[PDB]
Design a protein around this ligand. Structure first.
Ligand SMILES: *[C@@H]1O[C@H](CO)[C@@H](O[C@@H]2O[C@H](CO)[C@@H](O)[C@H](O)[C@H]2NC(C)=O)[C@H](O)[C@H]1NC(C)=O
Ligand SMILES: *[C@@H]1O[C@H](CO)[C@@H](O[C@@H]2O[C@H](CO)[C@@H](O)[C@H](O)[C@H]2NC(C)=O)[C@H](O)[C@H]1NC(C)=O
Ligand SMILES: *[C@@H]1O[C@H](CO)[C@@H](O[C@@H]2O[C@H](CO)[C@@H](O)[C@H](O)[C@H]2NC(C)=O)[C@H](O)[C@H]1NC(C)=O
Ligand SMILES: *[C@@H]1O[C@H](CO)[C@@H](O[C@@H]2O[C@H](CO)[C@@H](O)[C@H](O)[C@H]2NC(C)=O)[C@H](O)[C@H]1NC(C)=O
Ligand SMILES: *[C@@H]1O[C@H](CO)[C@@H](O)[C@H](O)[C@H]1NC(C)=O
Lengths: 49, 96, 50, 106
């Protein structure tokens, strides 16, 4: 609905705030995974025996 | 059709940057470092050490002499293998 | 596809050890936030002005 | 926790809304391969390092500290005896010097 979006524009930057917060959470999760698992810069391998 | 409806309502799930296989690869690298090099790889270059000598170093860390580990090496290895098997059985047999 | 890191096969054997013969004194930086900007809002003046 | 490497000390620095820690750490470098053994068999007794590790450069056996290469002669002062040579897996035969031996010999 275009008319709904036009009425939604009167409320300001609520949509931008919600998108920014979700984007921050989304990058935060990847940062969490990097912090926990990507703690070595060398990929070590076990000997064949 | 829960996922389809959630997608269709303007909510989109974004894939993790690290895929499960790469996270598994990172865990494999950490396991290879801690097994072949002990704690050396975490503090600098990976220095190879035999695993019984590494376990003896860890025994010294908790205040037990090296001889206790070396004399009872087969018993300690059997206990560790049994414990790992018990861990796999416990995870497979418990829903919670 | 992103590279996790450089492959480094450690030469593990049952009777060989690697001993450091030298050292590097490395200084590294760690930045930690401690405080934020302290904000006070006059609720009546913000919502209603005068 | 306090930098990459074995932590030696840290220095605090003020920053706008924050702190910067300069972590001074010890990083091992220029590592060298050595042949290692868990214990030394001498006179039917097993000798274990008191604080170090047994290393071999190819022909001779020494005891050195784990985090830096400083080879020293294997004596009764830096090793301790626990048991015979029949139990430890990978024990090698080498002599263990006695400081008291030249003293009572002369
Ligand atoms: C210790 O010796 C091992 C092998 O005896 C060395 O490992 C080799 O390193 C070269 C160059 O890095 C590789 O091309 C070989 O494939 C490695 N061999 C194995 C079996 O991994 C190791 O580099 C030596 N350590 C030092 C510090 O020189
Ligand atoms: C240990 O490494 C240091 C450097 O980390 C070496 O010092 C260097 O020695 C060469 C020749 O003696 C000089 O040209 C360099 O300027 C020195 N560097 C520094 C930072 O002082 C030292 O020689 C190494 N020691 C051993 C036994 O390998
Ligand atoms: C391992 O180190 C020892 C001691 O540093 C070496 O023994 C000496 O070797 C030099 C030259 O080869 C001789 O002049 C000395 O007489 C030796 N000392 C003793 C007490 O015998 C030994 O050669 C080194 N091994 C290798 C393979 O380099
Ligand atoms: C280390 O020394 C011991 C004792 O000198 C050696 O054990 C002897 O081995 C010979 C040959 O195999 C046998 O005939 C003797 O009966 C053994 N004696 C004892 C008390 O066990 C042992 O072989 C040596 N090990 C190495 C690797 O040289
Ligand atoms: C080390 O392994 C090699 C071959 O893998 C074998 O010949 C040797 O007996 C082993 N030594 C010890 C102390 O286990």
């Amino acid at each position: 609905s275009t008319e709904c979006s036009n009425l939604l524009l009167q409320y300001g930057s609520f949509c931008t705030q919600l998108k920014r917060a979700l984007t921050g959470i989304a990058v935060e999760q990847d940062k969490n995974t990097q912090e926990v698992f990507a703690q070595v810069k060398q990929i070590y391998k076990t000997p064949p025996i | 059709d829960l996922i389809c409806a959630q997608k269709f309502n303007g909510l989109t799930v974004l894939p993790p940057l690290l895929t499960d296989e790469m996270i598994a690869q990172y865990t494999s690298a950490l396991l290879a470092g801690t097994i072949t090099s002990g704690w050396t790889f975490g503090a600098g270059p990976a220095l190879q050490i035999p695993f019984p000598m590494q376990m003896a170093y860890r025994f010294n860390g908790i205040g037990v002499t090296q001889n206790v580990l070396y004399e009872n090496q087969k018993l300690i290895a059997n206990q560790f293998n049994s414990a790992i098997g018990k861990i796999q059985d416990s995870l497979s047999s418990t829903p919670s | 596809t992103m590279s996790l890191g450089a492959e480094n096969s450690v030469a593990y054997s049952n009777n060989s050890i690697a001993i450091p013969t030298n050292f590097t004194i490395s200084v590294t930086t760690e930045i930690l936030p401690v405080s934020m900007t302290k904000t006070s809002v006059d609720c009546t003046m913000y919502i209603c002005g005068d | 926790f306090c930098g990459k490497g074995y932590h030696l000390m840290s220095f605090p620095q003020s920053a706008p809304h924050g702190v910067v820690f300069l972590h001074v750490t010890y990083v091992p470098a220029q590592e060298k391969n050595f042949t290692t053994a868990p214990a030394i068999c001498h006179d039917g007794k097993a000798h274990f390092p008191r604080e170090g590790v047994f290393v071999s450069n190819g022909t001779h056996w020494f005891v050195t500290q784990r985090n830096f290469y400083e080879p020293q002669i294997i004596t009764t002062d830096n090793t301790f005896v626990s048991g015979n040579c029949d139990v430890v897996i990978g024990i090698v035969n080498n002599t263990v010097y006695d400081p008291l031996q030249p003293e009572l010999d002369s």
